[PDB]
Amino acid sequence: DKYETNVSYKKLNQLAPYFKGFDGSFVLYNEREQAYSIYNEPESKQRYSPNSTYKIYLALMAFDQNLLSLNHTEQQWDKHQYPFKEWNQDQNLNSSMKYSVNWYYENLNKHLRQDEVKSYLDLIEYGNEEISGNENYWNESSLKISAIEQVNLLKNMKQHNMHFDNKAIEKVENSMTLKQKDTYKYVGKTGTGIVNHKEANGWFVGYVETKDNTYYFATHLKGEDNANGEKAQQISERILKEMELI
């Protein structure tokens, strides 16, 4: 399950303590310096199920297929009771992304033919592009992507290299904007994969756009348990704060 790249990078092996209890990776790409920095290069290349981090691209696909459009991202909650209060309400793109509302994205994916998805995954080079698995191929199933690739895709998205409309990209960015300050925009998305009732796969990917640069990042956690997006985000924030990016 490995992404093969010979790209150079600055090693961040001193970030190891942040990853206590996990086989984790942190990948940073500094846009201005066109430079990667990586903690745990081997793990950086290992592809894992994206879980909710896939929602970023599923949203883009949905825009591209006009499932979503300007002033047209709402979905009404059918009153089905989910485990998370935030899912138990009407949604728009922002809320569905912030709260990782699976049903909203399942509803969008329903209108995407398998071949359309495959086409998009090819265009955006989404990891192994394998979607044979479950209907929810993005959730602890066949589709897997590495931390470095998560960064590459964010970068290609943000730089508008992807063949998605820029306004769609801006909408998706907004939907994953965690903090907007004068000094930076902090964008990120969690994912968590559960196997055997354990959190075994945690993601937090995003970027910090400052007044002069953009720092794309992906943190992955693998562990027997507790490897979840929340912890991945906590760790990411610790690192980004140590780096004085947020």
């Binding site: 499932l67 047209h72 979905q75 009404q76 049903w103 909203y104 399942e106 509803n107 969008l108 329903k110 209108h111």
Partner: peptide, 4 residues
């Protein structure tokens, strides 16, 4: 199932 998004409706639109």
């Amino acid at each position: 199932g998004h409706m639109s």
